[PDB]
């Protein structure tokens, strides 16, 4: 009886929140992202009997990373030159090589422009690919920029490339970050290995779409993460752990030209292309995908006990969804991907390569919004990266008899960090409480 | 406050091709989805199928992929769908709803239009 207040200092304990995070770069910096805050040294410890529960569909941070890159977007972009002088009417015969179909824009389209000395108009030429051109209405030889009808363009900084640096997180003084480690968790639900850190590792901005490529690889065998409160899904994450590898490249020889605009400041462009004409293209070896495509299916049919299964190619919308969509070197790409996904099941080491054949084009749009469409400058000679894939983005139509079917989207640019910030969820410390004892003053 | 109105419509002739619209209001045009969901007369509503306005994804009932069409124009926030060999059977009302969703899942219809 008679026990008293005693009042302790400092316990450990937390409650859920959400908090504003800082952002720490590599010490060979870029050359708030470009050289500081500063690397730490990463540490981890395990912690016994440690009971908490995680949520990948809640978490906050995946939210702030969606302002954090287009923040630094246009922070990058915002001082570059305009291009609204060169958006006028175009005569484009271009019929002037030996093969010109592909691409249908040729020197030898040519429009007036301003120049240096600003009060006289002066006539050049360069090249262009038909997917960043239309046509206007009645004269077939009359032809528009796609986006000047509703935008202004921004061009590129030509001494500048934003390229995937890999960016981590560390909590502010009172935050504390929980990883948990267990390799069958779906995402949601409670883990039993709970752990602590100062901060996350590496996570890189890459974009891509109909798969998730650069990026890190999962540790035990493929794992299925979704939703649980409807199974009318809108995207399912499959996570690989066997990295397939592919190549692309982009034979042709381009040679750049420019044009300057008094007041200054330089517009770059297409010109003379060498070489022998050729598509684009890239190669997988069949035996590693067909296999892995298997175990995906053997692991799929768990939340789909009895039914068919069968993958069927994208369909509908922008370009941005039909294809994959992925950039090396600074320029961006576009792959058919029928071939790929063809395939079919039911209930109960290099040889084989496939090859697919992509288009490029040079005005792209951030993948949601309007009116802010970026453009590149063609980079000179020829391209080629080696790539790896480490997960797919699935949705599935409406079930139907005694068969299921999915098939490749993923427009949304949130998903794709959605699949690498899994593990984090971030919570704040209250150091104080209380308890009863018996102690006496004393004094 | 947030409207979706309706044109076109009116009759039309066995066998031809058909359209319709909306447009949206001031609301988002980014966030939400939308749905056509038709009704024959004194019968039980049915559902086509619902196109995101944000790259333009399509899916269809499975009674009708060889005869639909979606597709969409964020320009000026409007939607057009193509309807193409009209059957007999075809004859009823149009609508046009938005869908309220979280991230990874969706729910209730709210606004019909």
């Known amino acids: 009886e008679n026990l008293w207040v005693t009042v302790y200092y400092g316990v450990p304990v937390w409650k859920e929140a959400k908090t504003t995070l800082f952002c720490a770069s590599d010490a060979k910096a870029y050359e708030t992202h470009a050289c500081v805050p500063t690397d730490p040294n990463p540490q981890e410890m395990v912690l016994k009997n440690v009971t908490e529960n995680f949520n990948m569909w809640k978490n906050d941070m995946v939210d702030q990373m969606h302002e954090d890159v287009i923040s630094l977007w246009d922070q990058s972009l915002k001082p570059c030159v305009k291009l609204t002088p060169l958006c006028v009417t175009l005569n484009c015969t271009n019929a002037t090589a030996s093969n010109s179909s592909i691409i249908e824009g040729m020197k030898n389209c040519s429009f007036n422009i301003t120049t240096e000395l600003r009060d006289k108009r002066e006539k050049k030429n360069a090249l262009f690919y038909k997917l960043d051109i239309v046509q206007l209405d009645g004269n077939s030889s009359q032809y528009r920029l796609i986006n000047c009808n509703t935008s202004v363009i921004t061009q590129a900084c030509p001494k500048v490339s934003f390229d995937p640096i890999p960016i981590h997180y560390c909590a502010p003084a009172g935050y504390a970050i929980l990883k948990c480690n267990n390799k069958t968790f779906t995402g949601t639900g409670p883990c039993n290995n709970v752990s602590t850190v100062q901060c996350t590792h590496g996570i890189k901005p890459v974009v891509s779409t109909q798969l998730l490529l650069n990026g890190s690889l999962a540790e035990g065998e493929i794992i299925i993460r979704s939703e649980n409160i409807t199974k009318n899904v809108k995207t399912i994450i499959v996570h690989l752990n066997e990295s397939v590898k592919i190549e692309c490249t982009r034979p042709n020889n381009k040679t750049r030209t420019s044009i300057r605009i008094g007041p200054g400041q330089w517009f770059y462009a297409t010109g003379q292309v060498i070489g022998d004409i050729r598509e684009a293209y890239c190669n997988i070896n069949e035996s590693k995908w067909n296999e892995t495509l298997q175990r995906v299916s053997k692991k799929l049919k768990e939340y789909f006990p009895h039914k068919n299964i069968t993958f069927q190619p994208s369909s509908g919308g922008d370009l941005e969804i039909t294809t994959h969509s992925f950039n090396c070197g600074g320029e961006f790409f576009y792959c058919n991907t029928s071939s790929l996904f063809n395939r079919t099941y039911m209930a109960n080491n290099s040889t084989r390569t496939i090859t697919i054949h992509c288009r490029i084009k040079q005005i792209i749009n951030m993948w949601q919004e309007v009116g802010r469409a970026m453009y590149a400058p063609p980079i000179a000679g020829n391209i080629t990266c080696i790539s790896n894939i480490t997960g797919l983005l699935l949705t599935r139509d409406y079930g139907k008899n005694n068969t299921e079917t999915f098939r490749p989207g993923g427009g949304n640019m949130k998903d794709n960090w959605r699949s690498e910030l899994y593990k984090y969820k971030v919570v704040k410390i209250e150091p104080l409480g209380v308890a009863p004892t018996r102690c006496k003053r004393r004094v | 406050q947030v409207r979706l109105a309706q044109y076109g419509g009116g009759v039309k002739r066995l066998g031809a091709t058909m359209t319709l619209s909306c447009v949206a209001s001031?609301?988002?045009?980014?966030?939400?989805?939308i749905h056509w969901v038709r009704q024959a007369p004194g019968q039980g509503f049915e559902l086509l199928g619902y196109?995101?306005?944000?790259?333009?994804?399509?899916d269809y009932a499975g009674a009708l992929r060889e005869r639909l069409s979606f597709y969409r124009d964020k320009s000026m926030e409007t939607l057009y769908m193509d309807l193409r060999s009209l059957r007999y059977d075809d004859t009823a009302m149009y609508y046009c709803?938005?869908?309220?969703?979280?991230?990874?899942?969706?729910?209730?219809?709210?606004?019909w239009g």
């Open positions: 196109i995101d306005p944000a790259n333009g994804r399509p």
């Open positions: 001031g609301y988002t045009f980014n966030d939400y989805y």
């Open positions: 709803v938005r869908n309220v969703g979280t991230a990874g899942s969706l729910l209730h219809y709210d606004h």
